[PDB]
Amino acid sequence: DLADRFAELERRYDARLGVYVPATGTTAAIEYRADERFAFCSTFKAPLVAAVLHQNPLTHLDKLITYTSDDIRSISPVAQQHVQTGMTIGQLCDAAIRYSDGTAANLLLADLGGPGGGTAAFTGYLRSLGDTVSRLDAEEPELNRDPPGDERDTTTPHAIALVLQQLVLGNALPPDKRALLTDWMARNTTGAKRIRAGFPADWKVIDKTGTGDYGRANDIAVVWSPTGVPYVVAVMSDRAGGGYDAEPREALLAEAATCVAGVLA
Ligand SMILES: CO/N=C(\C(=O)N[C@@H]1C(=O)N2C(C(=O)O)=C(CSc3nc(=O)c(=O)[nH]n3C)CS[C@H]12)c1csc(N)n1
Prior knowledge:
Blueprint: H1 2-13, E1 16-21, E2 30-32, E3 38-39, H2 45-55, E4 64-65, E5 87-88, H3 89-98, H4 102-112, H5 119-128, E6 154-155, H6 157-168, H7 175-186, H8 195-198, E7 204-212, E8 216-224, E9 230-238, H9 250-264
Antiparallel strand pairs: 1-2, 1-9, 3-6, 4-5, 7-8, 8-9
Bound molecules: Ceftriaxone.
């Protein structure tokens, strides 16, 4: 049925596809390799912002953090323009979500403190939401480079979709803080050609992307039908058959999204 098209898309692009849509009151759950482990990549930056907000009052957003050029390890379109001025935590939240800024994600992890530069505290945050499967061990850019089969810095479409459901649709955050997280994801600038490109234009899409080596390309989203019904969609992919230098395929994540839309309609 639907698993034959996902398995078909896997064949067309030479990839491994993981899909999960948590069931609503009227629609059942969509699952394709939903419980297989995939690599977080940049998708952790969205629930990471929720950890910082959950721990501190809104006044913490105005605290300024200064850094040096030696701290810039990865793609950081915004952090590279502020080495002399510094950035406040709120701006680091903005950069980490809407621009996938890697340095801003590393600084926010250090704000969580603790061993591993904050990775153990971040894993602790996911456990508080009920996720006992996911784990973050390294920072940018090392967390995108773990070999296949290595369970470090991994999650599942099942686990990540339910985490995002609580932050956007649930009560994981108070309403004022919940408003800040959704707005940033709503004005994200990196996902134009993935889940957004698969749904019709009159469906609202907010998302956070992820990309790494071994052809890894992820997108996590909450979408709204024209009538206003919300759905959470997790799509993850890798192409380990082509090794470290595998080229990611954004078209695979658009096709899979369209398949999901034809079922939810
Ligand atoms: C939703 O994204 N769509 C985009 C897009 O990527 N736009 C960006 C976005 O959100 N932008 C923002 C900002 O962060 O506010 C800005 C702010 S840029 C900026 N403001 C400052 O105050 C400053 O000191 N320095 N800089 C550089 C404008 S473009 C961009 C787009 C590009 S072409 C097109 N048709 N759409």
